[PDB]
Design a protein around this ligand. Sequence first.
Ligand SMILES: [Cl-]
Ligand SMILES: [Cl-]
Ligand SMILES: [Mg+2]
Ligand SMILES: [Mg+2]
Ligand SMILES: [Mg+2]
Ligand code: NI
Ligand code: NI
Lengths: 131, 131, 131
Amino acid sequence: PRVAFYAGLKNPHEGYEVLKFDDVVTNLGNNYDAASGKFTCNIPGTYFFTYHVLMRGGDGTSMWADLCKNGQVRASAIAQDADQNYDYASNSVILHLDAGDEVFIKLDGGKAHGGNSNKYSTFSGFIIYSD
Amino acid sequence: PRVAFYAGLKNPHEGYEVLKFDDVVTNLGNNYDAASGKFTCNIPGTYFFTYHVLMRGGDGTSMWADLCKNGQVRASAIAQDADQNYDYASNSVILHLDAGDEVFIKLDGGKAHGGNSNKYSTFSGFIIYSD
Amino acid sequence: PRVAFYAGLKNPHEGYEVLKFDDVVTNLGNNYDAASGKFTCNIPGTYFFTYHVLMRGGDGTSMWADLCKNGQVRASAIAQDADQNYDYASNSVILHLDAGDEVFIKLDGGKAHGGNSNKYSTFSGFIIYSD
Ligand SMILES: [Cl-]
Ligand SMILES: [Cl-]
Ligand SMILES: [Mg+2]
Ligand SMILES: [Mg+2]
Ligand SMILES: [Mg+2]
Ligand code: NI
Ligand code: NI
């Protein structure tokens, strides 16, 4: 089973919402959906995910981006700079997933930079083991 | 051989010490030990590790977190902000390990945020190849 | 096929150039070349890469580091701090590569810290799937 994806944000996002990474570069298995921003598991197993979300510079001082499995937070990150500089909220996880499980990044608050085609803000993952 | 782990810090750590990540989410192979903070290799091979350690905000300006293999530093990271903002010391490695080799993250100095169940500060790794 | 590498920067780099990571720790497959700073694919397939580039502290406020596939940017990152503190430009990708494809990190501008043997600034990658 080949499952591996990588997407850039493209569009700026601000405020509480799912980050819908819309510049999809790689998507083996077709399990990442840019319309919803969710990776949906169809092969149960253990997966690696990582994300790097760039806080917009020049306007705002804090930004929170968390990785979720279904309802639940499984990693948290903050970017913060009192001078309103660009900075990243990034983290990585390894999670076991059942078929139907959704994994996605949520913006808790603050402003994420959408870098158009530049892929400043990213979300990727792949299956390590199949059950 | 299935070896893959992911743990959050949970408890705040400050000053020189091994970071004992105590919120263990995934631990295929049972090779990560929260009591010691160490991953101990039992299957010789080549491994990926990554860590993301959040510096506490509101008190302190620098924090250093390094990945060690046995005695030796194999990656270094610093978080620094003169306004005492949250920021991350993060890095990633690929290392060959022999049976008995220990891999762990050490706090060299500064204050790491323990995010309780929020998994702000993290350590993960998995085997890529078995010898 | 075993392909997996990890290298530290070692030497300081400043201004537009390819980052030639010269402290090579792991290099299964011998596909990373410190002389050029490039990973060259010989086994077509899908690959994971990550990089963590530390901006020098005490002199300068911004630094840009991008991952390239051949001519083209496939991930971008910025480090920025108005007080001239250390900060990281980091990102991760998953890319399909054909034989002959080159992957490397370019410094677009600013000053990257070469940490000698300390491995503050790093580049790693491995093959997930072979075609
Ligand atoms: Cl793998
Ligand atoms: Cl100031
Ligand atoms: Mg949160
Ligand atoms: Mg150190
Ligand atoms: Mg650029
Ligand atoms: Ni910062
Ligand atoms: Ni700052």
